[PDB]
Write an enzyme that holds these catalytic residues in place. Sequence first.
Site, PDB file in Angstrom:
ATOM      1  N   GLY A  30     -12.932 -58.433  20.173  1.00  0.00           N
ATOM      2  CA  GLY A  30     -13.127 -58.623  21.596  1.00  0.00           C
ATOM      3  C   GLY A  30     -14.440 -59.292  21.943  1.00  0.00           C
ATOM      4  O   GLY A  30     -14.480 -60.194  22.785  1.00  0.00           O
ATOM      5  N   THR A  31     -15.527 -58.857  21.302  1.00  0.00           N
ATOM      6  CA  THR A  31     -16.833 -59.443  21.580  1.00  0.00           C
ATOM      7  C   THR A  31     -16.907 -60.880  21.076  1.00  0.00           C
ATOM      8  O   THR A  31     -17.385 -61.774  21.784  1.00  0.00           O
ATOM      9  CB  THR A  31     -17.937 -58.599  20.943  1.00  0.00           C
ATOM     10  OG1 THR A  31     -17.704 -58.497  19.535  1.00  0.00           O
ATOM     11  CG2 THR A  31     -17.940 -57.205  21.539  1.00  0.00           C
ATOM     12  N   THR A  73      -6.118 -56.799  10.372  1.00  0.00           N
ATOM     13  CA  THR A  73      -6.674 -55.475  10.607  1.00  0.00           C
ATOM     14  C   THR A  73      -6.454 -54.949  12.019  1.00  0.00           C
ATOM     15  O   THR A  73      -7.019 -53.906  12.366  1.00  0.00           O
ATOM     16  CB  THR A  73      -8.180 -55.472  10.303  1.00  0.00           C
ATOM     17  OG1 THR A  73      -8.848 -56.391  11.177  1.00  0.00           O
ATOM     18  CG2 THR A  73      -8.433 -55.880   8.860  1.00  0.00           C
ATOM     19  N   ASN A  94      -9.812 -65.278   5.904  1.00  0.00           N
ATOM     20  CA  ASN A  94     -10.252 -64.176   5.057  1.00  0.00           C
ATOM     21  C   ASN A  94      -9.449 -64.036   3.772  1.00  0.00           C
ATOM     22  O   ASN A  94     -10.038 -63.797   2.712  1.00  0.00           O
ATOM     23  CB  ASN A  94     -10.188 -62.855   5.831  1.00  0.00           C
ATOM     24  CG  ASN A  94     -11.373 -62.666   6.758  1.00  0.00           C
ATOM     25  OD1 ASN A  94     -12.525 -62.776   6.341  1.00  0.00           O
ATOM     26  ND2 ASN A  94     -11.093 -62.379   8.024  1.00  0.00           N
ATOM     27  N   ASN A 151     -19.259 -62.899   3.077  1.00  0.00           N
ATOM     28  CA  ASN A 151     -20.398 -63.383   3.848  1.00  0.00           C
ATOM     29  C   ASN A 151     -21.379 -64.156   2.978  1.00  0.00           C
ATOM     30  O   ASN A 151     -21.994 -65.117   3.447  1.00  0.00           O
ATOM     31  CB  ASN A 151     -21.100 -62.217   4.543  1.00  0.00           C
ATOM     32  CG  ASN A 151     -20.150 -61.374   5.368  1.00  0.00           C
ATOM     33  OD1 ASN A 151     -19.041 -61.802   5.687  1.00  0.00           O
ATOM     34  ND2 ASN A 151     -20.581 -60.169   5.719  1.00  0.00           N
ATOM     35  N   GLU A 193     -24.017 -87.154  12.200  1.00  0.00           N
ATOM     36  CA  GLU A 193     -23.171 -87.828  11.221  1.00  0.00           C
ATOM     37  C   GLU A 193     -21.779 -87.214  11.161  1.00  0.00           C
ATOM     38  O   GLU A 193     -20.782 -87.944  11.090  1.00  0.00           O
ATOM     39  CB  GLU A 193     -23.817 -87.763   9.837  1.00  0.00           C
ATOM     40  CG  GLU A 193     -25.095 -88.565   9.681  1.00  0.00           C
ATOM     41  CD  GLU A 193     -24.851 -90.057   9.711  1.00  0.00           C
ATOM     42  OE1 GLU A 193     -23.730 -90.481   9.361  1.00  0.00           O
ATOM     43  OE2 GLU A 193     -25.784 -90.806  10.061  1.00  0.00           O
TER      44      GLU A 193
HETATM   45  N1  LIG Z   1     -14.891 -62.951   7.218  1.00  0.00           N
HETATM   46  C1  LIG Z   1     -15.226 -61.799   7.790  1.00  0.00           C
HETATM   47  N2  LIG Z   1     -14.509 -61.333   8.875  1.00  0.00           N
HETATM   48  C2  LIG Z   1     -14.843 -60.158   9.462  1.00  0.00           C
HETATM   49  C3  LIG Z   1     -15.911 -59.414   8.979  1.00  0.00           C
HETATM   50  N3  LIG Z   1     -16.022 -58.305   9.741  1.00  0.00           N
HETATM   51  C4  LIG Z   1     -15.059 -58.331  10.690  1.00  0.00           C
HETATM   52  N4  LIG Z   1     -14.316 -59.470  10.527  1.00  0.00           N
HETATM   53  C5  LIG Z   1     -13.170 -59.897  11.355  1.00  0.00           C
HETATM   54  O1  LIG Z   1     -13.360 -59.491  12.696  1.00  0.00           O
HETATM   55  C6  LIG Z   1     -12.158 -58.998  13.250  1.00  0.00           C
HETATM   56  C7  LIG Z   1     -12.436 -57.889  14.260  1.00  0.00           C
HETATM   57  O2  LIG Z   1     -13.653 -58.114  14.940  1.00  0.00           O
HETATM   58  P1  LIG Z   1     -15.012 -57.451  14.389  1.00  0.00           P
HETATM   59  O3  LIG Z   1     -15.864 -58.498  13.712  1.00  0.00           O
HETATM   60  O4  LIG Z   1     -14.686 -56.327  13.438  1.00  0.00           O
HETATM   61  O5  LIG Z   1     -15.783 -56.873  15.680  1.00  0.00           O
HETATM   62  P2  LIG Z   1     -15.738 -57.611  17.109  1.00  0.00           P
HETATM   63  O6  LIG Z   1     -15.353 -59.063  16.958  1.00  0.00           O
HETATM   64  O7  LIG Z   1     -17.102 -57.496  17.742  1.00  0.00           O
HETATM   65  O8  LIG Z   1     -14.649 -56.818  17.993  1.00  0.00           O
HETATM   66  P3  LIG Z   1     -14.882 -55.303  18.489  1.00  0.00           P
HETATM   67  O9  LIG Z   1     -14.341 -54.350  17.449  1.00  0.00           O
HETATM   68  O10 LIG Z   1     -14.149 -55.093  19.793  1.00  0.00           O
HETATM   69  O11 LIG Z   1     -16.351 -55.045  18.710  1.00  0.00           O
HETATM   70  C8  LIG Z   1     -11.338 -58.494  12.074  1.00  0.00           C
HETATM   71  O12 LIG Z   1      -9.975 -58.802  12.248  1.00  0.00           O
HETATM   72  C9  LIG Z   1     -11.895 -59.224  10.868  1.00  0.00           C
HETATM   73  O13 LIG Z   1     -10.978 -60.191  10.417  1.00  0.00           O
HETATM   74  C10 LIG Z   1     -16.636 -59.876   7.889  1.00  0.00           C
HETATM   75  O14 LIG Z   1     -17.583 -59.221   7.455  1.00  0.00           O
HETATM   76  N5  LIG Z   1     -16.289 -61.071   7.297  1.00  0.00           N
HETATM   77 MG   LIG Z   2     -16.601 -55.190  16.666  1.00  0.00          MG
END
Ligand SMILES: Nc1nc2c(ncn2[C@@H]2O[C@H](COP(=O)(O)OP(=O)(O)OP(=O)(O)O)[C@@H](O)[C@H]2O)c(=O)[nH]1
Ligand SMILES: [Mg+2]
Lengths: 427, 436, 52, 49, 58, 426, 434
Positions: free
Chosen positions: A134-135, A169, A196, A218, A244
């Site tokens: 969401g964020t 997820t 991913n 990461n 470029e």
């Molecule tokens: N490649 C990668 N993707 C990530 C990672 N952590 C979270 N995600 C992706 O982010 C998605 C969910 O959002 P999050 O990053 O967990 O958190 P958010 O985007 O702030 O959303 P909120 O939970 O509402 O706060 C998941 O479906 C993951 O695919 C990470 O460390 N590496």
């Molecule tokens: Mg989050």
Amino acid sequence: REVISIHIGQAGIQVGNACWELYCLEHGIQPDGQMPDAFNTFFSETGAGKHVPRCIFLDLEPTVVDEVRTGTYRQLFHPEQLISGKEDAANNFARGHYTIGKEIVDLALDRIRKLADNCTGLQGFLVFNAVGGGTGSGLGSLLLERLSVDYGKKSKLGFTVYPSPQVSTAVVEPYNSVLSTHSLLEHTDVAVMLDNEAIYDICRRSLDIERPTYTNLNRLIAQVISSLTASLRFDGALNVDITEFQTNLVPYPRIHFMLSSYAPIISAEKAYHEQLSVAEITNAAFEPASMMVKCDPRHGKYMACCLMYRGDVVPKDVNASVATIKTKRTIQFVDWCPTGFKCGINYQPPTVVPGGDLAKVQRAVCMISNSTAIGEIFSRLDHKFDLMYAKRAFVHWYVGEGMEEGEFSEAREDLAALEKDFEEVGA
Amino acid sequence: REVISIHIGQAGIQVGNACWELYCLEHGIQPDGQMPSDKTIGGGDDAFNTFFSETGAGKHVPRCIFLDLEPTVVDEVRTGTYRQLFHPEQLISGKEDAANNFARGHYTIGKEIVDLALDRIRKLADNCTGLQGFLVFNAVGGGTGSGLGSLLLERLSVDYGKKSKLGFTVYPSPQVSTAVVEPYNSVLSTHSLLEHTDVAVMLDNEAIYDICRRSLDIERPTYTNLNRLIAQVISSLTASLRFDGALNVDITEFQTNLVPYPRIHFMLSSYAPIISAEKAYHEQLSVAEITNAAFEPASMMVKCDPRHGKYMACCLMYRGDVVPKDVNASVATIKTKRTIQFVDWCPTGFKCGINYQPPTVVPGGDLAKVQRAVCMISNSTAIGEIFSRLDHKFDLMYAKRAFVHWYVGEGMEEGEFSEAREDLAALEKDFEEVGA
Amino acid sequence: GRLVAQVPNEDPERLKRVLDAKWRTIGVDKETLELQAQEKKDREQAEKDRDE
Amino acid sequence: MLPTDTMKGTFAPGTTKRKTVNMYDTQSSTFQPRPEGPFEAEHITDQPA
Amino acid sequence: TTVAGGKGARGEITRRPGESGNPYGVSVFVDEYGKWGSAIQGMPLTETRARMQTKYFP
Amino acid sequence: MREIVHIQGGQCGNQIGAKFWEVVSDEHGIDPTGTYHGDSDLQLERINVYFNEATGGRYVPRAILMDLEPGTMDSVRSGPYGQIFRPDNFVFGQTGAGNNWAKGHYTEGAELIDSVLDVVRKEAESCDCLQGFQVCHSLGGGTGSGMGTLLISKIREEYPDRMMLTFSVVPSPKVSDTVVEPYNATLSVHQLVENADECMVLDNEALYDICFRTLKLTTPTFGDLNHLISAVMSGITCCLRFPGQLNADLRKLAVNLIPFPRLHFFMVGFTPLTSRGSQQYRALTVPELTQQMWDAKNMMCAADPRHGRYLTASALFRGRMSTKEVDEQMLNVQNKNSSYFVEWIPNNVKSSVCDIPPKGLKMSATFIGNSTAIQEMFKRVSEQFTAMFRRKAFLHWYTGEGMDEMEFTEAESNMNDLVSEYQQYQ
Amino acid sequence: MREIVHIQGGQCGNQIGAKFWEVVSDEHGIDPTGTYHGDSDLQLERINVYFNEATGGRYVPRAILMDLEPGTMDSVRSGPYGQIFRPDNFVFGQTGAGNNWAKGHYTEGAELIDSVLDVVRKEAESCDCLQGFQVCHSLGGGTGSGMGTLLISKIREEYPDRMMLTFSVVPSPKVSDTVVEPYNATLSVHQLVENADECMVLDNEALYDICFRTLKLTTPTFGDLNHLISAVMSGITCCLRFPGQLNADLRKLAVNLIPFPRLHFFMVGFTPLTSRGSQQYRALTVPELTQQMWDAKNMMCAADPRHGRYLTASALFRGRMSTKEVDEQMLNVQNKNSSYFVEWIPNNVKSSVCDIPPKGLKMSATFIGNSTAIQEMFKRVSEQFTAMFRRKAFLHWYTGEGMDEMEFTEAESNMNDLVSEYQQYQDASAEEEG
Ligand SMILES: Nc1nc2c(ncn2[C@@H]2O[C@H](COP(=O)(O)OP(=O)(O)OP(=O)(O)O)[C@@H](O)[C@H]2O)c(=O)[nH]1
Ligand SMILES: [Mg+2]
Ligand SMILES: Nc1nc2c(ncn2[C@@H]2O[C@H](COP(=O)(O)OP(=O)(O)OP(=O)(O)O)[C@@H](O)[C@H]2O)c(=O)[nH]1
Ligand SMILES: Nc1nc2c(ncn2[C@@H]2O[C@H](COP(=O)(O)OP(=O)(O)O)[C@@H](O)[C@H]2O)c(=O)[nH]1
Ligand SMILES: Nc1nc2c(ncn2[C@@H]2O[C@H](COP(=O)(O)OP(=O)(O)O)[C@@H](O)[C@H]2O)c(=O)[nH]1
Ligand SMILES: [Mg+2]
């Protein structure tokens, strides 16, 4: 030649945690903030004997932000950098775009202005976010809109992460993906796709890690970003700036979605027996098994290709390898583009981190291309979104946060128009 | 000049295991991968360019892949002496075997393993610059060697085509065998072997057993000695590419000077002198007697009688203290002898090759250090006899439809059996017609 | 370079390492590779030790 | 006969930060020629000698 | 004196900077590098690895 | 002055040229490093024909090395006198022909002959006045037969009026190396009869016989045969390189050996050839040389002249000698066995004298005789060709390269016509 | 007296200028720190063409450098002979064109070319008898092609009668570095055909081929290619700086090489160029110079003159020679290959002699060929242009800055008429008039 990076969401700031650790280790900056001019594009000489990263970490939930605050790099980051809210968006695009996003957006934009003010030769912006959440989807969209209206034509590179097709997820993530891509289409300068499951396969196959965590993903993303920005940082035989990429990789303003590839991804032991040279790692940078998004370029046509070379690399062998690739018929270029290659060479070899899995490699390649498999990626996401939207599932949450069903539709036809555009261009 | 060898099947893996040990000992490469520290650079080095590539610092990886469906032999290789020699990704291993079934390994299991082998081969060939041609080792009696081996031949022909593919297969022996359903495997592999393999050489285990029991007086031989002999033959036929000679013959000459017709490529093989460490001292080895020794049926590596056939073509490999005068004399004496008759078509039926480096020896082997040796590769019509003999007993068991339900269940039909039958019959007829 | 220039156009180390074509074709840091290998071995040792 | 043997010229640093500090600062490093330094051989005390 | 004919035993023409048998060393001209079996002729390989960036060639 | 350009094709051509350049460099007194260290001023005045002055007494041969495999060039540069050749003259293919006339005549020769033509044009215009061209190759191999014949075609169409010699080794039935000898040999002969100015026929069977009976050697490797061929090649060209009482160039010999333009196939012999054990037990006199020169067992071809007629003949002598004995011996040998010489050509023998003998000798000679018994070998090859081709054996390795069945039929018809006319003139 | 100014544009132009100034400084005997320390008096008489005497034997190069990103200027300063260039001659901006002809021609060039004009005009009036301007740059980049062409146009507008050389490298398909090479190259050629007095076409294909085949170098980096180009320029300028038996200024070569004003595109080569391991085997005579001079593989463009006809030709000679041998070699090469020379001009070849050779040599040669086979490169670029321009590829990077499709159409049309004129002059009927 400064560049400031904005990190939106948990995933964005974890990627930033990897990236800034790599940057600090690469320029010799200790975690306390002292070295025992290449650093100028990421760090700023502040006071005397102190460096502060040019980055803003913004998230609506404290847990990860103050975990970063409490970690080893307490002194490295200015306290006012790590922006944190009070409540989460909770996987809700509408909530993070209208309800909580508006409250934290103003503070972030004022911090961005102060970093920009010090930035005298600001090349552009480059973003990190995951559209599933969401964020990273809701607040990221509004941040990009207001950042664009504040600047207009400044480059904003998008290292976004779409949900993977078969494995994911969450359940409400197609809605967030669609409502975020509706603005990522028109407000991002260059978007770099990052899936991913593709990185999971890369780690399982090449780095032979049977149990990879998000840290390895990461770390690989940080390696890609470092190999991408080394031309800005370190001098090479033939360097390329940020402009470029836009100039030579974006045939049309509505087509900016770049597949990412990197080579060589190798373990310490398998480095013993593989004859690691320039030609074969260029070959390995074009196979679908070593791409960072699980899509098959064999189904599509390359409009353009970019090549970043680091280490002991000369123009002769890269020219020979480009000729060899052009002679091959396994991958085919589009008819209107007869010179779809662009090469770049940098002197500085890639760095290594303690606890990492990559071996000490004297020559590496970072590939950024543009094909039409992104077209089938978008349709694959669209079919799953349409399956959910047919029964009006989870719509009541978004309606309650303050938006209406018209946005869902207009985003659906926006995706349809994008599919038609990608189909027409590839002909 | 480079040549990459692919070994398909458990028998192929053992043959490659012997071959690469012999190659490492022949070029002085230690089993751990790097040559000894006491080695001094000088003339005669760099000869390993066609078999080993130099990676990193002091490491030579063989230009090879072992591929199999059952992982036991691949794991034994991964745990044996040559742990550090082979690249881990080179040894392709499956998860389940074909279990003596052409159908399973050709249509069910081979489909998901053929792509990886081709992907590795593409980059191996890309590493090469002067690739001469491919050569394959397999046993058509088994499933993996015969079943998906045909698929690899199909896709190698599709990918490259003009590049040479040497097929050194292992046909089941006439009277002795280890399996039951091997006639179906052999027929179905032969059907695809005609139009893909450029040159084929027959390897039968019973003949090598007779050679070991009679000449090398080993009354309890195992597969290791047979593999050592096959590796010696392969080294004797690749040394001309590897080392300098007075008059050397390439892999491309075999097709030109031994294949009179596109569908007739089946070469009998012989080797001499096959002598132990005790007989070698007493008898003086000279080219006359070793050349005469590569002509009796008792020194052939396939259970066939060329006396019943006509020598269409002949090729002669020479290693060691050989001067052209005496080999010319020996071939003249053979040509004037009437116990063997040449076909009407090839009055100049000989092709000789002379190399300076004598064959090397391996500790734990049976052959001693010899001054000279001869490798024989000729063509005749006795292959039309062995194929007909396999024909009779394949039809014999196909009449009552035994074991056919396995192949039907895997996904075949009865049409493919019939078309392979007719192809083998047509090859038989061609063999009897060419000899007329 | 196009944007920055730290190393000069005739650095003795750079010129030496580029002129040796073998290093451009193949180059390793064997000691560091062994260190990484032992680090990996220690990590699976520590993992199974935590399990124990 | 490596080409670096005949390489002549004086080199300068590449891109760097602005100086922002003058030479009159005590913390600013400066080149002091005096004392005379390690003369080689004997009876090299005085300059025309 | 007899001269070995045909191919095999790569000589002064086939040898190149990048192949699978050639040693280390700084070389500016291919033909100068093409003769190391005639110039070195007896040094151990460990010494060639030790003298990493050095001429030691015609 | 008058310039000779050397051309080598195939493995045999390369080895023969290596030995030939060794012996020629020895004759003119240049060391294996390429510097002149001779004694007499005569060795220095006529080195332009085979060498070009580079710098400080440095002389490089006027030769081209051409084939389709790296190893031959590597071996050429490995052996002695391998550092006298200019590297630019090693025009060089990469894939190989390998005993295939079609491969070396239509596919592989197509993209290689351009570089060979450029090199030979550069080297021909380097000198002022060419005398002729010289070719050493094989009629049995792939890169020597087909590529050599295509080079002959191109260079005859480029330089029409210049001379040309061809030393070609033909396979013999007793010594058969490959299987496809007749297929290559017939087509190479078909090209050679219509394009070559004059041809010298060589074969390894005769050279082995010579090294067996005369030289009395246990192991006559290719070195001895190459030495004999190089000695003959030096003997043919002796008059151009040194003064003499009666000179004879290439054209002067050709006009005295070719009464009809299609009869330019000569059988060759060298003298003296005696074993070292019997070296002290003999005298050095002109009759002792002319008795061995006319002997049938001394010839370097598998065609007995006693089964035919000596249509013409030529003899080139080296060393300070008496012309009286030369003329008397030639007249006596012509008159004695008058049945072996043709009737309508009186004075069949051409003679020339040079006063500089080869190193280590005081008396030497060379024989080039145009006989009508040279068609015996042509019939012996054509019968094998007809036996094999009659039901398309080994044909697919030739038709698949673009060739047609007519190339075989036309080659057979022209070879049959050649042997028919050779038998007619008997 | 006679004065030549050097102008460098872009990264490639800056590196080529650095190498050229290194070789010229070595030739004239000045040290890397700028002072004279040579031996003979011949090194003082004609240094005014390239240097200005400042103080105590200090000679500053008469050059003006150009770029848009600090890396190139810093690399120029940090290299050897980097302390001779005047800091005021570094007219310069710090934003970067970024492989964009439009950016270097309308948006960035428009404000920086005024400072360039100030610097170059102060330079051109700082001399007595300006002989001509000399510019080296690229046609694939943005700050060298676009801004360079704009400077060429402005200089030609201000000084119309002065000479103008352009050492311009053109993109080639076997080695294509960037993607927008045809767009830059077509418009750059459209500008040069109307502004430049004469052009010498270079490309990395022929340089790499020369290094691989002739020099037989293992690793032909840009240093060797820049050295070859610098040797070409030095052999071009040699007549002015040193006495000889036959002088030939740039104007003399231009009038002896250009039969029509739009036919000012030359293909160039250098002689001799041999490997160090092979220099022992070869003879060292004038015929060896001439024979390698006329060779197609020695040329520095990817266009074989064998595919066309030689309109005119010129050869520049350095070192003490006999005019007899030079003249007879030229006569021989002109008479033997009769089909490769156009018919309506007898005696297509111009020759001159200088008494001072370049360093390390005693004699050398430089060849200029005005051939009609050069339009092979123009067609080979125009095909890629019209393939890319068919569906408005990468167009928004140009129309989004001020340009229109009409500029592209005009560039394509001009290039097509140029190649058509060259083709017609190739097969022009020998003996008629209308
Ligand atoms: N490649 C990668 N993707 C990530 C990672 N952590 C979270 N995600 C992706 O982010 C998605 C969910 O959002 P999050 O990053 O967990 O958190 P958010 O985007 O702030 O959303 P909120 O939970 O509402 O706060 C998941 O479906 C993951 O695919 C990470 O460390 N590496
Ligand atoms: Mg989050
Ligand atoms: N000459 C020779 N033949 C062998 C050797 N090992 C196995 N074979 C042959 O291989 C045949 C059976 O196949 P295997 O090698 O056991 O295994 P496979 O070829 O992969 O077939 P499957 O077991 O069905 O998967 C037997 O009939 C043997 O003739 C060997 O060491 N030497
Ligand atoms: N006299 C002589 N004959 C040779 C030599 N090398 C090869 N031959 C003969 O040439 C024949 C083979 O020719 P080949 O090498 O295949 O010709 P290529 O394919 O054109 O190189 C054999 O019959 C040999 O007897 C040599 O050095 N001397
Ligand atoms: N000959 C030569 N070519 C160069 C050099 N540097 C770059 N190039 C070529 O110039 C092209 C890129 O031009 P660029 O440097 O972007 O031009 P700019 O934007 O004006 O600085 C590439 O295709 C290179 O091959 C050099 O030093 N010498
Ligand atoms: Mg098995």
